[PDB]
């Protein structure tokens, strides 16, 4: 995507919120931005916490959400304004309500502008609202999983990515990551015990996409073969892109 060093960028900590909903998204010497999200069906609720790290009160504290044209048609975001005055040492909360319309790839950008000590401060950070947040885990017996896996005929609906692992292959962490990703983590479906099989329905207003995922660790090459088989080619592609960056 964007070339150049990603430090002090709009996506420094973006990847950290694909499988978890709580934590600090951004922090400079004046402001700390924390998050707490909750999702259900094709909806979500993201609490954004703005902490004033100084002994001085912030003014004109202004957070705004920015979405590209395509993203607009696939994702709907709503939020109530927060008080523009933030006491030094104080923390203020903002709630963002989410509704997924259709599968999407782009991410919303949160822009924050405010005054401190009489100076204009500007921050832009990508908000971690990703397609997987709208997963309904679907537990199912092995037999049912394979029947569904073999119902795929359109080659474009299958997307495979073979990539190098970025983190250790710590089983419980990977399980937590997959569970955190959203789908159900089906136990004992793939005869290969090292493989992870997930099944879920990506819920969007306009279409429910049945998703089956197979994550095949390659311990030696420290790579994974991720296969997404879903009822929609673009969903297969995006879920593949996202999950790929997580291991």
């Amino acid at each position: 995507g964007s070339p150049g060093i990603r430090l002090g960028s709009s996506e420094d900590n973006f990847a950290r919120f694909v499988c978890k909903n709580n934590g600090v998204l951004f922090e400079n010497q004046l402001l700390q931005i924390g998050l707490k999200s909750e999702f259900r069906q094709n909806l979500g609720r993201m609490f954004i916490f703005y902490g004033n790290k100084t002994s001085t009160q912030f003014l004109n504290f202004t957070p705004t959400l920015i979405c590209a044209d395509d993203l607009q048609t696939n994702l709907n975001l709503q939020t109530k304004p927060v008080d523009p005055t933030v006491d030094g040492g104080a923390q203020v909360q903002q709630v963002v309500n989410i509704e997924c319309i259709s599968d999407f790839t782009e991410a919303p950008v949160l822009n924050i502008q405010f005054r401190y000590g009489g100076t204009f401060q500007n921050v832009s950070v990508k908000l971690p609202i990703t397609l997987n947040k709208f997963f309904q885990p679907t537990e199912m017996a092995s037999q049912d999983f394979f029947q569904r896996w073999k119902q795929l005929s359109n080659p474009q609906q299958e997307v495979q990515n073979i990539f190098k692992a970025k983190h250790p292959m710590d089983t419980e962490i990977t399980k937590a990551k997959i569970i955190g990703f959203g789908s159900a983590l089906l136990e004992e479906v793939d005869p290969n015990p090292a493989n992870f099989v997930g099944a879920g329905i990506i819920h969007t207003k306009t279409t429910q996409i049945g998703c089956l995922l197979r994550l095949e660790p390659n311990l030696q090459a420290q790579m994974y073969r991720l296969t997404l088989r879903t009822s929609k080619d673009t969903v297969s592609q995006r879920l593949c892109e996202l999950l790929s960056e997580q291991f």
Binding site: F146, W149, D190, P191, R214
Partner: peptide, 5 residues
């Protein structure tokens, strides 16, 4: 053997 193909 492998139910994935």
């Amino acid at each position: 053997s492998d139910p994935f193909k």
